[PDB]
Amino acid sequence: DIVLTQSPASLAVSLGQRATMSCRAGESVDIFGVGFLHWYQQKPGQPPKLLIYRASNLESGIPVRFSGTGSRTDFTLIIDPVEADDVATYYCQQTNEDPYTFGGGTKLEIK
Amino acid sequence: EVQLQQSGAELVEPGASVKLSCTASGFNIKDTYMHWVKQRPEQGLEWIGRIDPANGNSKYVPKFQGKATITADTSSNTAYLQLTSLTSEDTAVYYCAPFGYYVSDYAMAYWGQGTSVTVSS
């Protein structure tokens, strides 16, 4: 199955600063050029929440301070500016192929 | 709205079984694969498998075969996850999430609130 690796394991940022994080796939997750790589926000004690699908498409209701890039194997989630609501663990997931797999998470904290 | 309502926390002993429910509203579960995801405390998300409620066809990752049984009852728009011969490794929050063209076509946009299962004497 396609292993997803996220870095860093945790990140502490100041309110208003830029946060960026990595999701790398051990095999390509593209379908006709589009990465079937999605990003979820999991706030403490809550279920995951979809932020971005197919690498760079924001779900409606997600503010534009969130963005994503990437194709094939190397993906990036960007949050700028970071706001207090954004405390959470961020996960990438691929649905290019069964079984669906998830990265290990990047835990975002505000200092 | 699209909603997923999961059953309440469980506190059970080693060797027992539990059957968790995920009731959908706002859409027909026959329009969606119903997926189940495991999260141990302090840990990440793990896919268990899914059911197609339209025909009862499930898929299971090898490590959950014989452990997890996923079923559905379309007359009550509900999906189920049964876990047997429980050990402490089964202590986790379990989430359901639909995936399907007319409801959540790209990723998992909708999640139940999760059901915590605790396995201990």
Curated annotation (Swiss-Prot), chain A:
<keyword id="KW-0391">Immunity</keyword>
<feature type="region of interest" description="Complementarity-determining-3">
    <location>
        <begin position="93"/>
        <end position="101"/>
    </location>
</feature>
<feature type="region of interest" description="Framework-2">
    <location>
        <begin position="39"/>
        <end position="53"/>
    </location>
</feature>
<feature type="region of interest" description="Framework-1">
    <location>
        <begin position="1"/>
        <end position="23"/>
    </location>
</feature>
<feature type="disulfide bond">
    <location>
        <begin position="23"/>
        <end position="92"/>
    </location>
</feature>
<feature type="region of interest" description="Framework-3">
    <location>
        <begin position="61"/>
        <end position="92"/>
    </location>
</feature>
<keyword id="KW-1064">Adaptive immunity</keyword>
<keyword id="KW-1015">Disulfide bond</keyword>
<dbReference type="GO" id="GO:0019814">
    <property type="term" value="C:immunoglobulin complex"/>
</dbReference>
<feature type="region of interest" description="Complementarity-determining-2">
    <location>
        <begin position="54"/>
        <end position="60"/>
    </location>
</feature>
<protein>
    <recommendedName>
        <fullName>Ig kappa chain V-III region PC 3741/TEPC 111</fullName>
    </recommendedName>
</protein>
<keyword id="KW-1280">Immunoglobulin</keyword>
<dbReference type="InterPro" id="IPR013783">
    <property type="entry name" value="Ig-like_fold"/>
</dbReference>
<dbReference type="InterPro" id="IPR013106">
    <property type="entry name" value="Ig_V-set"/>
</dbReference>
<dbReference type="Pfam" id="PF07686">
    <property type="entry name" value="V-set"/>
</dbReference>
<dbReference type="InterPro" id="IPR003599">
    <property type="entry name" value="Ig_sub"/>
</dbReference>
<dbReference type="GO" id="GO:0002250">
    <property type="term" value="P:adaptive immune response"/>
</dbReference>
<dbReference type="InterPro" id="IPR036179">
    <property type="entry name" value="Ig-like_dom_sf"/>
</dbReference>
<dbReference type="InterPro" id="IPR007110">
    <property type="entry name" value="Ig-like_dom"/>
</dbReference>
<dbReference type="InterPro" id="IPR050150">
    <property type="entry name" value="IgV_Light_Chain"/>
</dbReference>
<feature type="region of interest" description="Framework-4">
    <location>
        <begin position="102"/>
        <end position="111"/>
    </location>
</feature>
<dbReference type="GO" id="GO:0006955">
    <property type="term" value="P:immune response"/>
</dbReference>
